[PDB]
């Protein structure tokens, strides 16, 4: 029951956002990242991604690991602290050898977004 984009933006606005972003950029998928448990993992301020359709899940997972563990340390600089992260799509582990389009086609939310979650634990 943690705070998400659904609580921030109405269903009708989200549908409109994703529809026009998908018409404008048909080769990219809209992804929102959400924190799924309470731990030492930080809440990322930027959580909306427009991911190339042919990007591998394993590749996007690598990118997402870094993002979650990086914070701004001024201009030209980012501080990276190593932490173990587990990633989830619709409560399951994203399959590393798939395309990000596949995840989108399989687990896309009715509002048009692919919702993905991170946790410090491997469970849910």
């Amino acid at each position: 029951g943690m705070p998400s984009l659904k609580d921030e933006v109405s269903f009708e606005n989200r549908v409109a956002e994703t529809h026009k972003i998908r018409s404008k950029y048909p080769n990219r998928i809209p992804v929102v990242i959400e924190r799924a448990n309470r731990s030492n993992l930080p809440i990322i301020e930027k959580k909306k991604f427009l991911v190339p359709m042919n990007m591998l899940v394993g590749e996007f997972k690598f990118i997402l690991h870094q993002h979650i563990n990086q914070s701004a340390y001024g201009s030209n600089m980012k501080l990276f602290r190593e932490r173990t992260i587990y990633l989830f799509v619709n409560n399951i582990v994203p399959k590393t050898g798939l395309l990000m389009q596949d995840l989108y086609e399989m687990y896309k939310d009715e509002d048009g977004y692919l919702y993905m979650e991170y946790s410090s634990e491997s469970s849910l």
Binding site: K46, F49, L50
Partner: peptide
């Protein structure tokens, strides 16, 4: 209106 655009 902000999106991150990841690359390879």
């Amino acid at each position: 209106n902000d999106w991150l655009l990841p690359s390879y």
